[PDB]
Amino acid sequence: EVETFAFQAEIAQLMSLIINTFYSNKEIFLRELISNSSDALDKIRYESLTDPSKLDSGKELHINLIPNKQDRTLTIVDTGIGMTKADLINNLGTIAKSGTKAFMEALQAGADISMIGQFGVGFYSAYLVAEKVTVITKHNDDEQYAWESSAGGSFTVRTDTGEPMGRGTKVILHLKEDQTEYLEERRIKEIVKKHSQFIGYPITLFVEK
Ligand SMILES: O=C(c1ccc(O)cc1)N1CCOCC1
Ligand SMILES: [Mg+2]
């Protein structure tokens, strides 16, 4: 049971702009994804302060970065609050329509693609490096879903029967052939140190055999 959905026109436009604009500073995608993860983790931590049972789906609050050169994927896993199916369909928890309007106006006026996170649509910077993005997520109030999109104006949602996550969000970046630098340990470490120094959760970079 796979459901296919059209992006809102303004979100298809943002994705196209991201894909088609010449812009060399692509490494900011990782900062934006880690930032989203940090915000998701903040959310569950806040809930947990008045209801400890909120962490029954897992107490550890962290971010893992998992490169796989065989599959040409980079995976960003967090144990944050996760997303319900509704929030996944509603632009992965963002106010993407108004965010994209503001970002576009900022760009027309001299901002650049690196400032995307100030407009609350940083998720979509994944498409600077990924030909396809898969998002697996689990929220305490819903089941585990997989969202997926190779852009082109549509995404799919299905119940995920894969490995259960407990709680949180996993973003799997199926990288463009020319973007495999972001599987290399030294490159990922450099990006993290440069851009994510003040993220208040452990970020563990996995190594490959
Ligand atoms: O799970 C996520 C999430 C995590 C990481 C991403 O890259 C995108 C969404 N979110 C739900 C809580 O509100 C923030 C978004
Ligand atoms: Mg913020």
Structurally, the chain folds into a number of domains equal to 1
- For 31, the domain range is 1-209
- Could you say which ligand is closest to the alpha carbon of residue 41? 1
Nearest to 126 by CA among 112, 113, 139: 113
Q: Could you identify the atom of ligand 1 that is nearest to the CA of residue 87?
A: 11
Q: Which two tokens stand for residue 180?
A: 């495999």
Residue minimizing CA distance to atom 14 of ligand 1: 40
Identify each DSSP E strand in 53-209 by its residue range. 63-68, 73-78, 130-138, 145-149, 154-159, 168-175, 203-205
Task: Please state, as a whole number, how many other Cβ atoms lie within 10 Å of the Cβ of residue 94.
Answer: 19
Give CA–CA dist 207/43, Å, rounded.
Answer: 29
Nearest to 93 by CA among 30, 171, 152, 162: 171
Phi, psi of 135 (to 5 degrees): -120, 115
Give CA–CA dist 204/189, Å, rounded.
Answer: 10
- Centre of ligand 1 to C-alpha 33, Å, is 8
Nearest to 87 by CA among 34, 45, 141, 13: 141
Residue minimizing CA distance to atom 6 of ligand 1: 36
For the chain, the distance separating the N- and C-terminal CA atoms, rounded to the nearest angstrom, is 36
Question: Pocket residues for ligand 1 (CB within 6 Å)?
Answer: 33, 36-37, 39-40, 43, 78, 80-83, 92-93, 123, 137, 169, 171
CATH number at residue 146: 3.30.565.10
Sheet (strand 63-68) strand order:
3-6, 154-159, 145-149, 130-138, 168-175, 73-78, 63-68, 203-205
